[PDB]
Amino acid sequence: EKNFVISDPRLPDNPIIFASDSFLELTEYSREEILGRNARFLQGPETDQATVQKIRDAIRDQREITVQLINYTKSGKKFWNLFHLQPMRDQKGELQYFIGVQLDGS
Ligand SMILES: Cc1cc2nc3c(=O)[nH]c(=O)nc-3n(C[C@H](O)[C@H](O)[C@H](O)COP(=O)(O)O)c2cc1C
Numbered sequence: 001e002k003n004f005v006i007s008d009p010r011l012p013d014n015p016i017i018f019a020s021d022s023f024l025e026l027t028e029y030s031r032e033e034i035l036g037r038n039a040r041f042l043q044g045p046e047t048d049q050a051t052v053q054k055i056r057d058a059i060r061d062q063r064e065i066t067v068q069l070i071n072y073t074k075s076g077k078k079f080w081n082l083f084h085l086q087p088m089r090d091q092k093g094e095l096q097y098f099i100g101v102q103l104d105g106s
Pocket residue numbers: 005006007014038039040042043052053055056059069071081083085098099100101102
């Protein structure tokens with residue numbers, strides 16, 4: 001998993017708290033530009049709203065999902081993101097983070 005971010009769903013709007021070096025390369029953002037923000041900044045005009053709903057539902061249900069959707073780099077370059085979400089639970093079985101892995105399928 002080279003490109004990924006980890007979010008903290010115990011903080012408001014599930015902000016990114018960690019972004020891998022490859023993710024920065026992929027997306028053209030600096031670490032400072034994106035930590036503390038929700039990963040939906042990757043979306044834009046052509047991102048399929050139905051697929052986003054599929055992600056929203058998986059987050060709500062706290063389950064794994066793999067979808068493919070149009071994302072955008074900082075300059076506004078489109079790419080096909082083969083995206084996999086995974087809930088991560090602590091030692092009490094309580095939701096603790098989400099990991100999001102991106103694969104540029106373009
Ligand atoms: C860890 C994590 C990684 C995510 N990575 C992406 C991503 O790479 N691309 C994307 O379009 N959305 C990604 N999302 C989803 C958005 O953050 C958001 O959950 C999605 O747009 C659905 O929720 P919303 O309707 O409130 O926008 C990620 C979410 C989480 C929690």
